[PDB]
């Protein structure tokens, strides 16, 4: 068969930051060539593996994670990076074997009023663990007094949405991010490049 990497990259819609969307790719053969050919990607940064030897390598599983963040926050999606998104919304381990790819999505992910469909985890009590998702909508108990379900002084919504206007600057302009995590457990190698 053929690995459906392109479906992830060419998906019509992409997941929000508040919940990254992950698809596990297994028992297929992929050409990493199509990814490196395309000039669409603004960010092609590989951590823990050289891109050249990827086709030669065989991986037990290959996970593709999809989300849409503001362009500057793309730098946050990297090993050992401290930020609101990296610490809370989506986290990458210090030992990371995979690549981060990103392209501008202002053509599709922005409206004149702004798209509020994609949101980030503004407040969380503890930093999220690597490769973990939390969609909790409990109001942040910033105050000593409990929130008791009401938005109030020292009480804050867990999430806040980007407002994506095409006129907005590149950092605030949307960027679409695919994270490729390469998994080599002590298991049979399901995914390999034909070469």
């Amino acid at each position: 068969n053929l690995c459906p990497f392109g479906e992830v990259f060419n998906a019509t819609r992409f997941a929000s930051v508040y919940a990254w969307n992950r698809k596990r790719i297994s028992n297929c053969v992929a050409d990493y060539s199509v990814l490196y050919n395309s000039a669409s990607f603004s960010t092609f940064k590989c951590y823990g593996v050289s891109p050249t030897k990827l086709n030669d390598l065989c991986f037990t599983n290959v996970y593709a994670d999809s989300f849409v963040i503001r362009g500057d926050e793309v730098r946050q999606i990297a090993p050992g990076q401290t930020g609101k998104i990296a610490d809370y919304n989506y986290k990458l381990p210090d030992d990371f074997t995979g690549c981060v790819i990103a392209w501008n999505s202002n053509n599709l992910d922005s409206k004149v009023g702004g798209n509020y469909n994609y949101l980030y985890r503004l407040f969380r009590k503890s930093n999220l663990k690597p490769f973990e998702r939390d969609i909790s909508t409990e109001i942040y108990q910033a105050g000593s007094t409990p929130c008791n379900g009401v938005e109030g002084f020292n009480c804050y919504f867990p999430l806040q949405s980007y407002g994506f206007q095409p006129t907005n600057g590149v950092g605030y302009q949307p960027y679409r991010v695919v994270v490729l995590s390469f998994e080599l457990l002590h298991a049979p190698a399901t995914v390999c490049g034909p070469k």
Partner: antibody, heavy 128, light 107 residues
Framework: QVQLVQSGAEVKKPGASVKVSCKAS????????MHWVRQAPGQSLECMGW????????KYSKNFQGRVTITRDTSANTVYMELSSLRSEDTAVYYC?????????????????????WGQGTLVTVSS | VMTQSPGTLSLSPGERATLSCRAS???????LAWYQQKAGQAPRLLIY???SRATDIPDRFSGSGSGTDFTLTISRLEPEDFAMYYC?????????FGQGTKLEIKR
């Protein structure tokens, strides 16, 4: 936590050699790179060079070149800066900092400009 | 070098302070990063990439990027904010650190 620990303050006679050590903790030593930045008293920061802990590969600034050697020990997660033939102008505070290295699609290593964490700083007084 | 102005920028408590870094070929669409240095202590990063903040940085700190130049913003001034602030980027020559601006408050 992520901790960078630097050697104690040093007093050295002119023309001698200073060796300043930066310990690493809380992160994978090989996966990040170490930069050394010097602050002369009441002056701006200057990046002397960068060590890649995995590769051992070194690059140096031209102004400080000819005196600075930056080394590494994989075992103790400790990076060393050595400066030699100290001039009086050399007296400064020297810092160690951590930069992620990334890989381009062609496979060549590159340094992320961000200096995420900093060492406490070792002071070198050069006095007759 | 990178133009960080002035050598001293002074601001009243509760006011908003703006620190400016400008360069032509250093920025070159590359990233600009800001650090905070308290008196007698090593620099601590405040903003990386001019719009993203590390953890343990209060929300009052904020940044912007405008082509050749970028800025550091402290909307609310507190005694703790008293420090020397720096800007960094990469150029054709190795990475460049700005001269730095000292922030002062009325007391």
């Amino acid at each position: 936590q992520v901790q960078l620990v630097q050697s104690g303050a040093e007093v050295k006679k002119p023309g001698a050699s200073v060796k300043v050590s930066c310990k690493a903790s809380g992160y994978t030593f090989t996966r990040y790179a170490m930069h050394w930045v010097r602050q002369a008293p009441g002056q701006s920061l200057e990046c002397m060079g960068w060590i890649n802990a995995g590769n051992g590969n070194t690059k140096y600034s031209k102004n400080f070149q000819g005196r600075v050697t930056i080394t590494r020990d994989t075992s103790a997660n400790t990076v060393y800066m050595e400066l030699s033939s100290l001039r009086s102008e050399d007296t400064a505070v020297y810092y160690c900092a951590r930069d992620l290295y990334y890989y381009d699609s062609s496979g060549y290593q590159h340094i992320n400009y961000q200096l995420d964490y900093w060492g406490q700083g070792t002071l070198v007084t050069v006095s007759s | 070098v990178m133009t960080q102005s002035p050598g001293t920028l002074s601001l009243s408590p509760g006011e908003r302070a703006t620190l400016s870094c400008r360069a032509s070929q250093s920025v070159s669409s590359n990233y600009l990063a800001w650090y905070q240095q308290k008196a007698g202590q090593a620099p601590r990063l405040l903003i990386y990439g001019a719009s993203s903040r590390a953890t343990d940085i209060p929300d009052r700190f904020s940044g912007s990027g405008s082509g050749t130049d970028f800025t550091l913003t402290i909307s609310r001034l507190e005694p703790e904010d008293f420090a020397m602030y720096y800007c960094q980027q990469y150029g054709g020559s190795p990475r460049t650190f700005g001269q730095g601006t000292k922030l002062e408050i009325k007391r």
